[PDB]
Design a protein around this ligand. Sequence first.
Ligand SMILES: CC(=O)Nc1nc(C)c(-c2cc(C)c3c(c2)CN([C@@H](C)C2CC2)C3=O)s1
Length: 827
Amino acid sequence: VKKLINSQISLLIGKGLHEFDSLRDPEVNDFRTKMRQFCEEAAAHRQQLGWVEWLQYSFPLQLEPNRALLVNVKFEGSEESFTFQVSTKDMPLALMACALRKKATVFRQQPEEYALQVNGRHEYLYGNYPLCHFQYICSCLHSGLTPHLTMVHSSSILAMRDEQSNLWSLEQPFSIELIEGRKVNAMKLVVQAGLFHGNEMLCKTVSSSEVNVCSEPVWKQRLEFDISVCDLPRMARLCFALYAVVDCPIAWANLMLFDYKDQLKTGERCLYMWPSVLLNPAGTVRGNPNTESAAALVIYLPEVAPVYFPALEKILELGRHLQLREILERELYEHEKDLVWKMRHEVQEHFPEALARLLLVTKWNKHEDVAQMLYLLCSWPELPVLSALELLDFSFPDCYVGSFAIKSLRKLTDDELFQYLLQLVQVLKYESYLDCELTKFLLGRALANRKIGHFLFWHLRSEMHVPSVALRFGLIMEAYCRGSTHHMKVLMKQGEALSKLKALNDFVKVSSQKTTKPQTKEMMHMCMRQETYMEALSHLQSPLDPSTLLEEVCVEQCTFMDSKMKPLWIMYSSEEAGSAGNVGIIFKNGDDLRQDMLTLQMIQLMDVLWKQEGLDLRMTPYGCLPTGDRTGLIEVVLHSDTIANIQLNKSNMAATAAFNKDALLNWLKSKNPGEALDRAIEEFTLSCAGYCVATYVLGIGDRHSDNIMIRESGQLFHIDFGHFLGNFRVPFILTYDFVHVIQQGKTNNSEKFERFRGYCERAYTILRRHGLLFLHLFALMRAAGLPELSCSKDIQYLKDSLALGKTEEEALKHFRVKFNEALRESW
Ligand SMILES: CC(=O)Nc1nc(C)c(-c2cc(C)c3c(c2)CN([C@@H](C)C2CC2)C3=O)s1
């Protein structure tokens, strides 16, 4: 059983646990033992949670960022149910009271003993919130559906819990010996070397002498750096770059000068290098695992003796010892930097949220100054979440700064954590050591919230094919599995389904090139009807949303789309869920989805920020999740079609039109007869404004009818981008056919069109006020290595699009010019 769990973890993470042992790495060994203990302690705490607390762990509340409605309620094991009329302002407890009173009269004879389950879902309604604060209830109101809920007793919840159990003296200049290499190229070879603290250099870079490409090259020369050994900061990074010249990049490699035990490193080191696109300080500090083919560089760190980095007590001991200040404190010159450092005590006392700027002006290549910074840091007041997100960036590489950022981030709600989880996982790629505060923070939150654990796992699992993170991410996942053996098995079931979908999709790719679609579709179904497929594809939690249950696969309704990669369309049904159980997922394999996944998350964030200000633009933040190498799932939006399909203006249809411009409007009329047409045009108008502003801010062009879809409700959404941040300055885009629907099919309708302009302006001004949040998240995403999110010019695009330099009046003026130009562009 102990053996079995190891084999199950190995299969789940895609890497045998035996491979960790074979490295013979003390840091790996210590990480595994320490974090296993940490995660098993979390498990012990979880298994003794009270039933309400377990609900909060397993089914965390999905809330939104008077009026009457019908609700159907039943009891766990019963066919019979009661339809109640309640108010939107009523609490769950009031609803549960009604249910128990009805049961008492039917059975002929305590609300606090119950929770309301959403039928056929792992989602619950509970707590002191009015019904309309829950996302499920709001979803039902907007779609006009009846909520269906099930009374679940505390003893049933506890049964779920139970079944799911488990130094300063060294003044000489820092130097190294470059011994030799082992490589392939066409010229002479040169090794550039630099000391870095994050992005900034600790001193000038030093080059090696030119040697012929011959060999297996040899140098055996000392490289001496312009910085004392006592002045090396704790997180000092020695970076190398091999290239050829008569420029031709070949390889690079980094390492930390101190090890994970705070000891200065000696002596000889073999650096297995990574291939280049000269210095790359943000690159990983672990060697290339492919030692067969990787070019190596052997070096010698001199035995200066055993020296450790000074402890915090010694650090603090050493350290213990105006209008224009404000005018610059909202890139700065030499005298301005000195002003800030001079008045660093005043920054702590009066301007604590300017810590970042203070950290950027401190001299990290002088230990007394670094010291002087850390004493202020250790009594620095906790900062808001927004400030802490900036501090996670690689520009702030110091470990005490990192620890301070995490300390300020502990007040993140689970909802905020979920929202920023993609970025936080990517920040792990900047980390220097395995055991770190970010990893412990994420694991802790993941074990305290099953939904966070679900998405943490998949973000990590989806990058196990990347050699530079496979070890780190594999270890984190192993640790998590030690924390929840039950959830490990739940995730294995998802993995087994995805394995079958990959095999099925490979068949479809081959088959689609050899026969007709009806024939490929029929053989797809025959493959799915195999017992191994029916079993593997049925009865699992959706990777897109663990609260969504994918029960019985509806083979007859499964198909594939015509796009190059032939993405699979998989439909499900659930008797217990009813119509809400009718859900679809798309499996797509062969394309890099990461950039589009980022775009969708950012649109999702925009939607939350708008709703927080009482602006609902009726967006469609459909689920999207990377699951493996160029593989991911997409949540199907049902009852929708492409603008292209509708604009074909097919005959013998309700949408058929006298002019092509009326095709969209006629389609909406057919789906929304009578008085319902007005709401659909509004839903269309609102969503159009949302996506117009979203694509403008994110710099998304290439917008055509094949990549835009419309729901029968009228809601417009996008299914391909991407292509963002001006990576084909993209203008604001207004399409004539959409303007036509907004104007109710009329040629002149300023009333409706200017309302639409108002929505766009309100949406735009709200995003400007959270401009810094976007900049900080995108900064952290530079860790991901996306082709179109590589440098400062990509970040600069957002500053320009949100006009953060300008005042609100100037920015709004500037936005109105872009809107008007887009209006003129429309025919
Ligand atoms: C009725 C109907 O077809 N409803 C639909 N709803 C959705 C949500 C559809 C959809 C389909 C596909 C093939 C994709 C997307 C969305 C988004 N997207 C990428 C940009 C993301 C993976 C990164 C796709 O590849 S199709």
